[PDB]
Design a binder for these strands. Sequence first.
RNA 1: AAAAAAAAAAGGUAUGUAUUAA
RNA 2: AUACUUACCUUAAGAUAUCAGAGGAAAGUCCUACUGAUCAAACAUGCGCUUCCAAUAGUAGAAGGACGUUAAGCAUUUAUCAUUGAACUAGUUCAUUGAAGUCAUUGAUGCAAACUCCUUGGUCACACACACGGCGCGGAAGGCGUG
Lengths: 68, 49, 101, 181, 74, 75, 49, 184, 92, 124, 119
Amino acid sequence: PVNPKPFLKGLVNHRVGVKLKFNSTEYRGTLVSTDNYFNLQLNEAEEFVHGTLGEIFIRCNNVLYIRE
Amino acid sequence: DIVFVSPQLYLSSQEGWKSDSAKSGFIPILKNDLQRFQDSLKHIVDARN
Amino acid sequence: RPKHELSRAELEELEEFEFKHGPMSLINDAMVTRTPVIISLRNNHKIIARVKAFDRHCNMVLENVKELWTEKKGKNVINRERFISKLFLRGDSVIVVLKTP
Amino acid sequence: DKYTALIHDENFSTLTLNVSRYPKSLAYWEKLLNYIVKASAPICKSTEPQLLKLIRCTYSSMLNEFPYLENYYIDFALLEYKLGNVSMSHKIFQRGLQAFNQRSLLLWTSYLKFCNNVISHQKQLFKKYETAEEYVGLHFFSGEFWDLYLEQISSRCTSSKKYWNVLRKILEIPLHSFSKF
Amino acid sequence: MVPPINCIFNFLQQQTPVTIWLFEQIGIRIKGKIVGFDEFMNVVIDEAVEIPVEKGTPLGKILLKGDNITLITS
Amino acid sequence: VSTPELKKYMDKKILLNINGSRKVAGILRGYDIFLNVVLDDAMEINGEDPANNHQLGLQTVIRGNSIISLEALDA
Amino acid sequence: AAAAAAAAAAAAAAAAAAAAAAAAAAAAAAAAAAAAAAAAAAAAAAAAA
Amino acid sequence: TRYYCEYCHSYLTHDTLSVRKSHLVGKNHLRITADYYRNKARDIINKHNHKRRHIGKRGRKERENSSQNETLKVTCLSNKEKRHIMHVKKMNQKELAQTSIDTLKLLYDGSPGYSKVFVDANRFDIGDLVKASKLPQRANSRSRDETCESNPFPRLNNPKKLEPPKILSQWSNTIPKTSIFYSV
Amino acid sequence: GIPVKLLNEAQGHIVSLELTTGATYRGKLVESEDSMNVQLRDVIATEPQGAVTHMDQIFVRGSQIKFIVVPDLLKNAPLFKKNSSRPMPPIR
Amino acid sequence: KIQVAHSSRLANLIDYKLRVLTQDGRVYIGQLMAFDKHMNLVLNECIEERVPKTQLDKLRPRTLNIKVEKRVLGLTILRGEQILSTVVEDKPLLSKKERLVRDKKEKKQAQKQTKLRKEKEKKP
Amino acid sequence: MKLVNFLKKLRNEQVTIELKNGTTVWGTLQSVSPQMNAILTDVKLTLPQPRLNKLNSNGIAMASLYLTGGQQPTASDNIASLQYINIRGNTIRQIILPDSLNLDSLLVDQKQLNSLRRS
RNA sequence: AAAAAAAAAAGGUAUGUAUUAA
RNA sequence: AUACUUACCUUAAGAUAUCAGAGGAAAGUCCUACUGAUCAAACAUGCGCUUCCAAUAGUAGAAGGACGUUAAGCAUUUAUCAUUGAACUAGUUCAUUGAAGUCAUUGAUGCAAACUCCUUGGUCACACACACGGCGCGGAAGGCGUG
Ligand SMILES: [Zn+2]
């Protein structure tokens, strides 16, 4: 019976992919922290749409879904 | 379910007095009553014979 | 805990925490350390710049902005660059913001 | 369902067989119709299409046997309008006006009354009234028709030229109510 | 009356599988087992697969945002 | 803040247009302040009435954001 | 009585509203009968004196 | 908050959909508001345009051409007269507002479909609405099913002959004095 | 605000709608809320491409409304009085 | 043409004929009367002007004459979500002095109403 | 903190408000509402030309630009000049402020200090 | 050596019933 | 307007320019028709400040419109899908069955002109005066400045 917010609290500092709603782009990286709006911070992220990205901030409105 | 009948075309001996599809002048009647319907007109035909 | 219960100062401590410890701490640490950031908008072109200020809504004030936008028609591409000294960016357009090494 | 519950009823078989035995009575047609309507009474878009097909074919087959019934072309038009398709309403108004050779006062008045609501494009709307005028305009009771048409100018037209233009023509017609104009 | 989020809670505990349509722009529909939800109608789906619009790839336990939700259908 | 007033609509078969293109018909069950509407015996209407129409599920819920207009075909 | 109260009131509460109305009318009739009995007793008390 | 109803000018405290809906439907509020728009509507007809006058210098030509033209007499009624004639004219406009000649409905009264069209309660387009338009009727027919089988012969001492066409009161002396034929 | 209060003042009168989808719903306004979502009675509908139909009852979401056309005689309605004098509110 | 006050906000301007731009590329021209927090405003006599898809090619860069199809809709209430920008077309039928006059007379009449109501309630 | 309170101190400055349409507005700036509603005075607002061998520009922004009444007939390119445009807040994308003003003086918010000075 | 009780309805809108004149 | 009966319901919070200095009840707060600076509003008041405000020495003209006519103007482009049978080239016509089907084809799109009609203005005063680009009285709309 897990809800979304404890699900993000359980996914901290685990490898998580996040699919944005636009190009079917997903950022694969270790989650750092989340806001109350589910803003995302990531370390060692990689952009799949192939690249490697050091640190990332993702705004809440553009994400489609979050997976592990 | 329902048959479409033209007592004018029937009493005039013409062929198409009935059809399954809806046409301009026909009257919808129950299919089982169709035979019954013929009975109701026979005396009229009997008067013309 | 919902926001309507808290008092006027508890919201100030909450925003101070969210900026200091939270996702937007990526931007905050970028403002203090003078590290240039890359920003992708939803308009599909990307500014390489330096953050003088930021805010809750993510709208932020920038200095030495360099905008990069490409366009293609029938698979004919051209890359265009546009330089700006100082800028104010409304935060609803942005999607991803990364902190350069 | 309601359809099959209507078929197996005895009244539908009796009324129907009476109609098909006695076509030109118009008493059995109107009972058959008034009954099959009342069986359908929630006649809105929810009722199943078999029943609507039967009642519709009943109207259209009655109006063919009696090409002059004005209130039945109107009534069947209004059934099609409550049912949600105005194109079928237009078409069967055209059908009724054609049965009368384009001159009947009630079908033109009750038609244009319908036409005010469902038709934009002021020009075409007025072309309907100019077509009605050259046909039924001189009818002795046609004044109420003109009362519509004048009513439609003063609301639509900013110029007021056309109101003087038309009302000047109404002055010369020997209607039942001339004095109103 | 059956409030809608009550019905969703009846999707959580009854363990019925659901197909869920997204916005018309994305072009994929998700299906899985709705586990729990928030006030914003963003839901966690266990054993979810993304079908383009039946060869879709399986996702996982995935949090899906409520902004893109159109239908939740059993 | 205020609950939308559908109170006369519920339990009546209703057609409502999802986004721009789609039109869903079903018997309204419940609703909320965001106009999220849950209904049963849902059917997705299309050009060919018997043919392209396909049922959705025993219970379907709709996000109020995708609701445009709601018409009841019923009393 | 049904046509008068059916317009404004919802149809689902029309039944229980109708039953409550009939019950109220019956109670009114009962009160009338009791008043009549009291009147008879008063008449008898006036006749005895 | 509080909902101030400016038509009635009376406050209602802590606005709620129920209480506000009850007040707006209320009979008193109804009369007050309806009368309010009756006044605000009668004003635009009552108000005189009073458009501004722009007077130019008359030229030497048209003063000479207009001097040879004789001066016309003007008529001006007394105050007591003009008050009465304004009353009469206004009451005549109010009459032309409400006329709405229905004679077609009187012609078809015995038609076979008269009950489905002109009764307007039992119609299709307007039929269902009239039911919800019926007042709450707080305290204190012509069914559609009719057929031609009733009143088979429209004339058996039943009908009144058609009402004569009206005439203007002003010009009523214009009428031909005598009829051509002898009516009973 | 005044714009919504004018929509509440238009109840029971024929109004026109434009939804942001492009359609046009003209008919009589039964209900309206402060969320601008209204329900209309006996309304004629114009699809975005012009096809016109008729429906007895409709409910529309206020977020999808673009403009609403209201009977003109509401222009001089008391909502638009700038300097107005209210009495004292009752004490509760 | 018309010079708007160098500092004038949406509240300063009433009864001016405005020109309103929406997200869809159509314009509503008319007198503003009210507005709101989220900037949905009420126009008195307004006409929506539209550039057809067929005339649009005429606006692309090369005296241009555009046929702008427009329809008249009186006393509307716009929605703040759709509004994009607002421009001033004309100035009101009345001058500033005259509007001061009618404002003062309206206020005096309003006070007279409160007195006539208070003393009609008090004695009876 | 609300960074919009910064824009309210930028009053009476030359600015470009670059909107979501791609439309750009050069003008003198007046009071900015708390919702970022930006009201300007003497403005020249235009659309950029994507070159790319005739790539059709925004079709909605051309219509919205001709419908301001400020586009003059003899303009060869696509521009309009007008006085007093009022812009809704959610339409703004970027704002390019002049190079001359210093941020260190304007970026100090008095409420931020006031909270710290009082504690 | 220590000690002991409390003070109160509010007022808005709507519906029905009765009263306020030859 | 008063009395009685029944129904529907009740308080988002806070604040009223900012900055600085001096004083009263080491830290902070509150306060001073206290002192300065800046800002804002109202009211006055000025600028050789800017723009605009129509013929009568004539039957005109400027701005804006017509949801006006010519006008079936001229030039273009459009009028449903599925199933079965017959003929047919190797797609076409006719008949039947089903589905939906804004009206229009005198339409819709583009092009242009002529005519007619509506609303608006100081239709003010002095002047019919050979100059190198003013300094009549007002009204409308602004900008700037002082109090
Ligand atoms: Zn009231």
